[PDB]
Write a protein that binds this ligand. Sequence first.
Ligand code: BT0
Length: 125
Amino acid sequence: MNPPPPETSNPNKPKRQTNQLQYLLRVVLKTLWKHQFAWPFQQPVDAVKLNLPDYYKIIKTPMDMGTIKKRLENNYYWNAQECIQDFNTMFTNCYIYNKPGDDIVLMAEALEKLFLQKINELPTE
Ligand SMILES: COc1ccccc1S(=O)(=O)Nc1ccc2c3c(cccc13)C(=O)N2C
């Protein structure tokens, strides 16, 4: 069974746009999105569709790049670190739920390397 997807808007949370957050949407996310291993991470895990009934019994802070994309498009984040933390949650969830060497983990490890490459240098204020 699927829990509700993570929020992509929250009127109680203040919004902000920065050069670094614009970069994270325009170059980091949009480039990762085109990677050949991106497709498993482009939407929230649908436990019913993918036949993973234990996913949300294990993973209590789900995150995906479709959620991050909508958050960036909506200026949901206060700063780039909050967005980077969502990316890191997405990668760590994959390592937590699976085991080393699994095909999905190899996909996540390659995307994580490309992500770290791209956020190594951010634009300034
Ligand atoms: C049951 O399906 C599969 C079984 C084996 C390999 C691949 C798939 S899958 O790619 O078709 N389904 C999945 C999509 C997204 C994810 C996972 C994870 C673990 C296992 C499956 C999947 C996971 O951490 N994420 C983010």
